[PDB]
C-alpha cells in the first residue's frame, strides 16, 4: 500500500526540515545518518519506527511526534552482528521519556540475550520536565540493564553532543567513551546552578568540554576531529574486540613473519644513564605492522596501553613511560592501567608488560590525596588476571614497583630482562648511605664504597642466581620470543575458590 | 558507601536504606575532579547486589540521585515512604522557571504557578499511584516494619549469566 | 497526618456503600473480607494501595478509582509466608487494564524470587473492553509468569464467581482449581455468542456451572457449599504442601501409633469374585487419624487420588476403585491420575498404590476417543517418577494392566501382594479358550481344562516364583509395613541423563 | 500444534508461526469436552520454548487468541505484521454493541459508531503505537526476513530455575 510508505517517508523526517537544517549548519550529522554510516550496506533493520509518547498533561497531548526521539536497530559490521541505537536530537531535543526508555531496554535486553555487542551514540538534551516522576522510572531501568551486561559483551558510547543531566551516569558505566572534540560536553550539573550557587562564571565548553574530561578527569578515552573520523575509528576498533566473553579473540591473516630479528633495537638505550628514550618506538616495533590503537593517549602520559597484534592475534600492551616524569607511578597511571587490565582479564585477551620504573612519586599532594589505595589497585588488577602474562624487564626496577608491575611472585609466566637492567631493593647511594650510617664523617670511603655496591649488585645477574629471572635475552630476538612464547601459552587453564566476586579497593 | 555496599554484598547481609538527598553538589572543583565516574560507583555498587535491600524515603528525593540511591527500578526489593516525602524530578522554583519559561516576567503569575505546582505534584502519592512505592506508612511503624520485611526475605535467590568478573568503573 | 488516614480509609471503601450491599444480598464477601478470613490475625501487609489507571478514551478519565480493582499483598499462614491477590468485583466489575496487570505482575514476581506458595481468588468480569489492545498485553505478562513458576512454587486458584473470556486460561495453567457450588461459573465464550452462532439456547448456569465441571469437563478439582467453607478448606489443603521445590514435605507430631495391628482387613475382600468391596475404607484405616484429602471426588470415580499423612509426613495415595465399572482404567482415569502423580513427583512427595484392575474399558468409543494415548500418560508418569513408590497389589492385575499400575518392571520399588491377588496375562477362560482351540467343541473337557488351568496360575505364588513380588504379607500388617518401608526410602538417590525436558504424549 | 511445539523445542530447532485466528470454537459441545484446559496447552507450549520464535501476523489476530499464537509478550522473539493485520480487544461491531449498550435500538447511530471504531482501531498502528509490533513489513519481502532473522538469533542463550520438571496440564 501506498499509505504506509507515505507513512514511512513522513517517519523519517524527524522534527521537520528546518531543525535537520539548522542541525547541518552546526557542522553535525543526523541520527540515521550516523546509523547508515556505522553499519555494512544494506543490512540496517529497525524496529519500532511508529512509537509515540502517551503523556497528555501540560498541554503536552497536542504534539505527538513518531519515534519519540531514538532510532533503534540491528545490523552488521564487517560481517559480525552488533545491535545499537541513536538518540535524536531534533525530537524534543532528544529527551527520555517513559516510552522512549522502553524501546531502549528492548534493545539492550534482547543484545544481552543474542550475546553481541552494543553501540550507544549520545545526543540528548537531559529530562523531559513535562512527563513527571515518570521520566525517572525510565532512566532507572535502563541504568540496571547496563551493569547486567558489564563484562558479559562490550558497551562503546560515543558522545556528539550535549549529554546533561541525569542521563550521563548511563554511559559512565560501559567499557569505552568517546568525544568529539569541538562540539560535544557532558556534565551532571549545568553552568545555571553553578553560577547561582558559587557565583562563578563559567561556560559549557570550559566546564565540560572536550578537553576537560580527555586530560584531567579520567573520563574520556580519546578525541577526535569530526563525526566521521569517530564513526570510522569505532568501526576499526570493533574488529579487535572479542564478541562475547565465551569465544576467543578474531584472527585475521598476517602479512609479516614470525622470525625476523630487529638489529635496531641493540641501540635503544641510551648510554648515560640519565637521558630518556621513546618506549613508543619500541611497542611499533614489536607490533606487526605498526599498527596501535592507542586507549587514553592524552591522560597520565607517564603510562602507555593500547591494543595491537601479534601473529593476527589481539593482544594488550601497558608499558612504562619514561619521556614524563622519569616513568614514576603515581596515581593517575594506576588507576588508568588497573581498569584496563581489568578489562582485557575480562574477555581473555593475552598481556605484555614492559617494565622502566624507579619507583612511586613523592609530594605531600600525592600522599594526601590517597596514593596508597590507587597504588593498590593495579597491584589488584594484575595479581588476580587468569590470563597469559609475559613481561620484559628493560632498564629499571627499583624497590616496592617492581613487584606491582606484573613480577614473577604475583603471578607472571614469563619474565625476561634485557642485558642492560638494574634489578635491585634502591639505588645505590641511599643503600649505601644506609648500611654504612656511622661511616658518612667521610667522603671518599663512602665513594668507594658505593662505587663497590653498584658494580657488584646493581645488574641482573644476582636477580637471575636467585631464580626470579627466566632467562636473559638480546635485544635484537625479543620479538621471535614474544611471538613463541604466547603459542605455547594459549592453553592457560587454572581454578579459584568460590567466591561471589572480589571486594578490590575503590 | 560503594565500598562498603559491596563488602555488606559479598558476604551476604542484609542492607537497609535511609534516603534524603536534594541532588547533587555543584562546582567546577566537582567536575574536574571527576564526579562522573564516582558517583556511578554507588549506582553500580547497588544495582549488582543479591541480597534483600530495603529503603526508607523520609524527605527529600529529587532528579537523578532519587535513582542511585537503591530506589525500585535498579532492584531495591521494598519501598516504603513517610507522609512528608517530597518526590520530584527538581524543586519547584526551578520545574516552573523551566515550564513556563515564556511567561517569567511577571511575579503573581510565576507565584501561582508555583503553588499550584507544589500542592500538585511535590507529595508521595503521585510517584505512590504509579506503584513506585510499595505503601505510604506511619513514622511511628517504621522499626515494626523492617523486622517484618527482612525476616522474610531471607530466601532471596536470583542468579545472573556467567561472567568472569564485573567490570566497575574504579 | 490525618489527611492520609482519611485517603486510605476512603480506599478500604472500593465502589461505595451500595455495592456493598448489593454484594452481600448475593451472599458473597468482599475481597478484604476473604483476606482478612484467610490469614493469620494480624498479618497482612499490602502494596500498592492507590494505584490507579491511566486510560483517557471514552469518557474513562471522568471516574478515578483507588486501587484498580484488585487487592494484593502477602502474609502468613501457621506462621508459613504465603502471597496472594484477590480480585475486588465492585470496581469496574474487577476488569484487567494495564495497572492492573501491573499489580499482578509485580505480587507473582515477588513469590516466585522468595519461593512461596500463590493463592488467587477470582471474582472477576473478564476483558476491559475500553482499554482496547493494551488489555491484551496485561494479560500475555501474567500467563507468562504462571507458567516460569510452574514445578517451582505450588500455585492454588480459587474461583469465587464469574470468570470469562481470556481470564479463564490463567487459572487453567495452575496447579488445583476449586469452585463454589452455586454462584460461579467458567467458560471462554459466554450464552450470548452461543445463541448468535449454533442458534442453542442455555444459560450461564448450565453451560459452565459447577457441576458441570466438577462431573463431565475435568477441569475443577472440588466444590464447596459457601465461600466460608472453601476458605477454611484451603487453608487445611495448604498446610499439606511442600514450600517449593527445594524443602522436604512439612513435618508435624503425630498422635498415631506406628506399630498397631488392624484385624478387621483379614476380612475385607469376599470370597464370591462376583461382589465389589470399597477402597476408600482401606485408605482410610491406613492414614493416621483417617483423615484423607481427596482430590477430584465426583470425576472419573473408578480411581481414587489424595493426600494423607504417615507418620507425620505427606504422603499422596492412588488406588482402583472396584465399586463402578468393575475398577477398569479407561481414558479419564488415565488422565486424573498422571496430572496427580506428576505433581507429587515434582515436589518430591512419596506414592503409595493400591492395585485392582482387570484392563481396559472396551467398546468403540473408547477407541474413537483416543484411549492409547491417554492410557500411554499414566505409564509414562509412572515409570518417570524418581521418588519412592510403594504399591500393593490387592485383589487383581491381568495384562497389560498389571504393568502401567507400578509394576517392579517399571520402576516400583517395593511390591507386595496379598494372598488373594491374582496375576495373570488374562482371565482363565479366555486363556483356556485360546489355547485349546482344537477342542472347543466339547463341554466336559473345556471344563476340565480351565479348572487346571486356574488352579495352577490364578494366584500369587507364580509371579513370586520369577521374583515379580518382593513379598507376600498377611493383610493385618500392611500399615506397619508401609510404615517401615518409607522410613528406608528416604534416602533415594538417581540419576538420569540431561535432557531439556521429556516429550510425554499430550 | 502443542505437541509438535514441545518435539520441535526438546531438540533446539527454531519455529516459525503464520496467525490467522479470529477467536475459539462457540458452542456446549466444546466446553463440555474441556476446551479449557486443551487451550492452556498451546500457551504452555509456546511460552516456555528457550529457541527462536518468529510470528508473522497476516489478517485477523482478535481477543484472548492474540495472545496464544506466540505474541511478544510470552516469549517471541521478533513480530512482524502485513499491511492488512487487525488487532483488537474483539470485532467491531460487537465492541460497539457492548460499549454503548444505552443506545442498542437506534440503527443510523450505531453504523455511525461502528465506522468511527472501525477506522480508527481496527489496523496494525494502533498496536505498533505501544510498541508491540516490532516491524510493518511489506508482503513481498516476507522471504528475506525470515532468511536474515533466524541468522542473528542462533545463539539465543538463556537461564531459568532449576526444576525438576514441570507440571503441564493434559
Ligand atoms: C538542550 C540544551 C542543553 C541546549 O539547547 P540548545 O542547543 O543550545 O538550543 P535551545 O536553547 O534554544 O533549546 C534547545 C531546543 O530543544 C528543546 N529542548 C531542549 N531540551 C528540552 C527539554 N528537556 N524538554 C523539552 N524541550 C527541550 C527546546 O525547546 C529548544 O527548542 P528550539 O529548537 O526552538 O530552540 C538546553
Ligand atoms: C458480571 C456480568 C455477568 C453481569 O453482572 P450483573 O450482576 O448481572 O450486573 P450488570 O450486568 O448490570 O453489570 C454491572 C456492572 O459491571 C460492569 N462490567 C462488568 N463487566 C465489565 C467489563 N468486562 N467491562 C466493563 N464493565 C464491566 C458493567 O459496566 C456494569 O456497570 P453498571 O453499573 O453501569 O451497570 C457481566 O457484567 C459480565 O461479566 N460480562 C458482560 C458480557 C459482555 O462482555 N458484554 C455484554 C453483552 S456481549
Ligand atoms: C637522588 O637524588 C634520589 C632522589 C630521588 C628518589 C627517586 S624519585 C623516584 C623514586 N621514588 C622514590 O621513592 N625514590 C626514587
Ligand atoms: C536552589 O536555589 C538550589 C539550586 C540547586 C538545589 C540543590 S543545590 C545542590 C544540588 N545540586 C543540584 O543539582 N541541585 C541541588
Ligand atoms: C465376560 O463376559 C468377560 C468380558 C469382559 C472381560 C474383562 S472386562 C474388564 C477387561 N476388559 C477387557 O478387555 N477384558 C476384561
Ligand atoms: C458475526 O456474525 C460473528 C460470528 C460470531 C463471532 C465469532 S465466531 C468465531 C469466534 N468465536 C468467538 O468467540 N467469536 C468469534
Redesign the pocket.
Known amino acids: 500500500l501506498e499509505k504506509l510508505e507515505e507513512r514511512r517517508a513522513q517517519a523519517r523526517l524527524g522534527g521537520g526540515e528546518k531543525r535537520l537544517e539548522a542541525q547541518h549548519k552546526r557542522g553535525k550529522l543526523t541520527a540515521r545518518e550516523r546509523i547508515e554510516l556505522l553499519l555494512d550496506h544494506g543490512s540496517f533493520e529497525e524496529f519500532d519506527m511508529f512509537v509515540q509518547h502517551r503523556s497528555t498533561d501540560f498541554g503536552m497531548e497536542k504534539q505527538k511526534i513518531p519515534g519519540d526521539g531514538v532510532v533503534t536497530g540491528w545490523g552488521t559490521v564487517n560481517g559480525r552482528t552488533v545491535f545499537l541505537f541513536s538518540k535524536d536530537f531534533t525530537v524534543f531535543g532528544g529527551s527520555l521519556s517513559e516510552a522512549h526508555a522502553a524501546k531502549i531496554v528492548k534493545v539492550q535486553d534482547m543484545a544481552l540475550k543474542m550475546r553481541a555487542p552494543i553501540i550507544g551514540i549520545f545526543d540528548a538534551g537531559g529530562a523531559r520536565i513535562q512527563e513527571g516522576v515518570a521520566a525517572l522510572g525510565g532512566y532507572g531501568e535502563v541504568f540496571r540493564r547496563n551493569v547486567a551486561a558489564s563484562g558479559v559483551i562490550p558497551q562503546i558510547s560515543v558522545i556528539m553532543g550535549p549529554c546533561a543531566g541525569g542521563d550521563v551516569y548511563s554511559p559512565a558505566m560501559t567499557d569505552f567513551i568517546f568525544m568529539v572534540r569541538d562540539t560535544s560536553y557532558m556534565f551532571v550539573t549545568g553552568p545555571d546552578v553553578v553560577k547561582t550557587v558559587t557565583n562563578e562564571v563559567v561556560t559549557a565548553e570550559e566546564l565540560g568540554g572536550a578537553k576537560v574530561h580527555t586530560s584531567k578527569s579520567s573520563i574520556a578515552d580519546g578525541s577526535f576531529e569530526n563525526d566521521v573520523e569517530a564513526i570510522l575509528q569505532i568501526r576499526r576498533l570493533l574488529d579487535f574486540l572479542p564478541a562475547n566473553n565465551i569465544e576467543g579473540v578474531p584472527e585475521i591473516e598476517s602479512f609479516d613473519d614470525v622470525n625476523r630479528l630487529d638489529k635496531s633495537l641493540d641501540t635503544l638505550i641510551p648510554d648515560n644513564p640519565n637521558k630518556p628514550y621513546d618506549m613508543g618506538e619500541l611497542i611499533r616495533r614489536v607490533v606487526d605492522e605498526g599498527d596501535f590503537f592507542e586507549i587514553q593517549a592524552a591522560y597520565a602520559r607517564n603510562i602507555i596501553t593500547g591494543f595491537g597484534r601479534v601473529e593476527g592475534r589481539t593482544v594488550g600492551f601497558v608499558a612504562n613511560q619514561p619521556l614524563v616524569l ?1 616513568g ?1 607511578l603515581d596515581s593517575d597511571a594506576s588507576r588508568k592501567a588497573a581498569r584496563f587490565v581489568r578489562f582485557c582479564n575480562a574477555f581473555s585477551i593475552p598481556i605484555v608488560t614492559f617494565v622502566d620504573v ?5 609530594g605531600t599532594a600525592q600522599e594526601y590525596g590517597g596514593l596508597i589505595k590507587h597504588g593498590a589497585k593495579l597491584l589488584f588488577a594484575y595479581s588476580q588476571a587468569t590470563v597469559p602474562l609475559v613481561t620484559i624487564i628493560t632498564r629499571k626496577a ?2 616496592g ?1 617492581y613487584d606491582v608491575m606484573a613480577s614473577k611472585h604475583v603471578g607472571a609466566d614469563l619474565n625476561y630482562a634485557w642485558p642492560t637492567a638494574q634489578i635491585a631493593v ?2 645505590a ?2 643503600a649505601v648511605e644506609i648500611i654504612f650510617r656511622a661511616e658518612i664523617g667521610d667522603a671518599d670511603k663512602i665513594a668507594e664504597r658505593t662505587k663497590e655496591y653498584e658494580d657488584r649488585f646493581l645488574s641482573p645477574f644476582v636477580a637471575a642466581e636467585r631464580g626470579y629471572i627466566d632467562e636473559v635475552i638480546m635485544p635484537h630476538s625479543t620479538r621471535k620470543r614474544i611471538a613463541r612464547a604466547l603459542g605455547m601459552l594459549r592453553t592457560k587453564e587454572m581454578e579459584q575458590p568460590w567466591k561471589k566476586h572480589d571486594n578490590i579497593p575503590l
Chains 1, 3 share one sequence.
Open positions: 622519569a614514576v624507579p619507583g612511586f612519586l613523592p627499583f624497590g614497583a634502591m639505588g647511594k641511599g
